[PDB]
């Protein structure tokens, strides 16, 4: 038996961050509050097909591996300097690819300049997924 149909699903993941200079720096002494997030556009659900999101913070951070298993996939923190932040997105999925890794640029602005509101769109294609993962991907 064989199939007469091919199916190709495209998903959009939004990753982004906000970064605000603190009024007073902490004892440590961090100068900014910032938050980094993974979400679907226009408040769409991605838990149907995302197993967990892994935020690899910089070494200088306590407990540098942060793991979110359920929405919101976000981390909130304070700091003094920007850095590359590899984000791993694991899928509710049988075969390759099981996860994918981005290098997210977590940058901060200086005092007297607006806060940071950065939004980045990444688009992935799953060519002929298994039927179960296709259902997870297009779930209402």
């Amino acid at each position: 038996s064989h199939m007469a149909s091919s199916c190709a699903v495209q998903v959009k993941l939004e990753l982004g961050h906000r970064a605000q200079v603190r009024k007073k720096p902490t004892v440590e002494g961090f100068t900014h509050d910032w938050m980094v997030f993974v979400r679907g556009p226009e408040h769409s659900n991605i838990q149907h097909f995302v197993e967990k999101v892994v935020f690899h913070l910089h070494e200088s951070f306590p407990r540098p591996k942060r793991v979110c298993k359920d929405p919101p996939y976000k981390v909130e923190e304070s700091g003094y300097a920007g850095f590359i932040l590899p984000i791993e997105v694991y899928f509710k999925n049988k075969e390759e690819p099981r996860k994918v890794r981005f290098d997210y640029d977590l940058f901060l602005h200086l005092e007297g300049h607006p806060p940071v509101n950065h939004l980045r769109c990444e688009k992935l294609t799953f060519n002929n997924p298994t039927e179960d993962f296709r259902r997870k991907l297009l779930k209402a």
Partner: peptide, 8 residues
């Protein structure tokens, strides 16, 4: 120029 210093 609009950005802070960075880490390692």
């Amino acid at each position: 120029t609009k950005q802070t210093a960075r880490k390692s």
